[PDB]
Amino acid sequence: VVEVPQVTWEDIGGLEDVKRELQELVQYPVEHPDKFLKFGMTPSKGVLFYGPPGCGKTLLAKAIANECQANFISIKGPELLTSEANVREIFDKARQAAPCVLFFDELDSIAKAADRVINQILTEMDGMSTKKNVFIIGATNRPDIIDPAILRPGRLDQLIYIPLPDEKSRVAILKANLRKSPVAKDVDLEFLAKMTNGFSGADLTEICQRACKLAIRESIESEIRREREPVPEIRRDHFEEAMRFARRSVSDNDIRKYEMFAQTLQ
Ligand SMILES: Nc1ncnc2c1ncn2[C@@H]1O[C@H](COP(=O)(O)OP(=O)(O)O)[C@@H](O)[C@H]1O
Ligand SMILES: CN1CCN(C(=O)c2ccc(F)c(F)c2)CC1
Ligand code: NA
Q: Domains, the chain, ranges and CATH?
């Protein structure tokens, strides 16, 4: 299904720098149209996100579409395998659906025949002007094997690091996830963020999911027995019990590799 996503910038904890850069990248063509004309600048055709899994790359792509009131079409790399007019149909349907965000996920799987499913993509990209109102986003967990062709000018205009959250970003991820939930005053998300160094945004969300299930199940069971003869809250002890099944999903070894790659790009 193709639709405007309901994810906003507010649902995304941390990454405040990346967010302002992305807003300007899409707001400037429409907010200062007379200045984009005077100096002869073309709006951007795409970006590429990279980083450890579960840290917000898909969320950012959806929030960009919600910003532009645009449709979102998501395509996972492995499923382009049956077959090179596959690459052509997708660009048609995205052009049909304009203004549209076209998101290529798991592009590490294609970086490894398949040699020019890539080449069919580069040709669709050059053949599609910015006047078509399609904005391309890719993501990958394997920045080491990115073909630099997809980044030459006229294609994806920026490569952007989305890292594991630091301590302040973990507090924000926790708050954004719980923003419309009834949380008890005895829970200290700043202490929770301290105890979860190395956790991804997805790892943090699961803790929030379990703690909520625990309070709802407890609500069920207690009314069932008071049946024998006031909105309930998610309490500190629900979070205490959710933490038992909590451990990092990204290894210290992969983090080093990601940090080397990004630090050498200074
Ligand atoms: N920065 C973040 N803020 C809030 N939630 C997050 C963040 N990053 C990840 N999550 C949680 O983890 C899930 C997976 O995030 P996703 O963006 O799909 O990861 P990937 O970087 O692999 O695209 C999200 O749906 C959300 O629940
Ligand atoms: C899929 N697993 C095993 C393979 N893998 C890497 O080799 C890797 C990790 C981080 C990097 F920054 C990088 F360039 C490469 C990713 C994790
Ligand atoms: Na990922």
A: 1-164 (3.40.50.300), 165-266 (1.10.8.60)
